[PDB]
């Protein structure tokens, strides 16, 4: 092993989730696959899925941690519903404001709620914006693109 460069690009959490779901579906690791192929019927094709417990476990834990509801209300993440063009529209609407690249990165990683979550995720909210821009961006991020 020789590390060549540390951080070639940044990843949105939506990209990570989509890639991991694609890997799960291609190797037939999903619960639908085991419900339809393994369970409730006898096996006749002998088409075993991919056999590597460590990668399966780490991918399952990551998709379970990403897909579920996050700390903004005590249903799902919201990422597991929104699509590519939704991401384009949402983050282009983000591009209209003065928030930086990494700031947009945490905006697209989690999704801020109305109560001081924007205050935590954005640095120096009062020094940036008045009330109307903050409430409208909160509306557009709570509207899920």
């Amino acid at each position: 092993m020789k590390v060549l460069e540390e951080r070639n690009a940044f990843l949105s959490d939506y990209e990570v989730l989509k890639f991991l779901t694609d890997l799960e579906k291609k190797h037939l690791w999903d619960q639908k696959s085991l419900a339809a192929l393994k369970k409730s019927r006898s096996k006749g094709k002998q088409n075993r899925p991919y056999n590597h417990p460590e990668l399966q476990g780490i991918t399952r834990n990551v998709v379970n941690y990403l897909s579920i509801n996050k700390n903004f209300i005590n249903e799902k993440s919201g990422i597991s519903k929104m699509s590519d063009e939704s991401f384009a529209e949402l983050m282009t609407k983000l591009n209209s404001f003065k928030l930086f690249k990494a700031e947009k990165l945490q905006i697209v990683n989690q999704l801020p709620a109305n109560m001081v979550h924007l205050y935590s995720i954005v640095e120096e909210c009062d020094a940036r914006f008045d009330e109307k821009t903050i409430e409208e961006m909160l509306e557009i991020i709570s509207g899920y693109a």
Partner: protein, 123 residues
């Protein structure tokens, strides 16, 4: 037989033990305590060392991230270091091939000055 000829000044008991000490046990007459003038001398040594180590001739030992945050605003490095070319240089003393890295065109500016009458020891 081999181990049967001991010299006049030894017996059968002294031999059979080859433990030459690796640690030393003989001190010099320089080892004593520190006096007042020697304390001032040590202060002079340590002050000179601390002066030169930060000086314009040191050479290297052979957060810190490039991300775009906003803590960098109105925040600036606590000192501007001195390079190899930020000192007066006599052109005649130095050789010819060394003129590349040093700056003939760049302005010769720095001439520091520092000495303290108070000891830099915390004891």
């Amino acid at each position: 037989n081999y181990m049967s000829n001991l010299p006049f000044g030894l017996g059968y008991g002294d031999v059979g033990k080859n433990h030459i000490t690796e640690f030393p046990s003989i001190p010099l007459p320089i080892n004593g305590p520190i006096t007042n003038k020697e304390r001032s001398l040590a202060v002079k040594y340590i002050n000179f060392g601390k002066t030169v180590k930060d000086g314009p001739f040191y050479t290297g030992s052979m957060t810190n991230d490039g991300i775009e945050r906003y803590s960098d605003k109105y925040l600036k490095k606590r000192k501007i270091g001195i390079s190899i070319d930020d000192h007066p240089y006599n052109l005649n003393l130095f050789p010819n091939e060394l003129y590349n890295v040093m700056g003939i065109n760049k302005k010769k500016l720095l001439a520091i000055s520092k000495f303290n009458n108070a000891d830099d020891v915390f004891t």
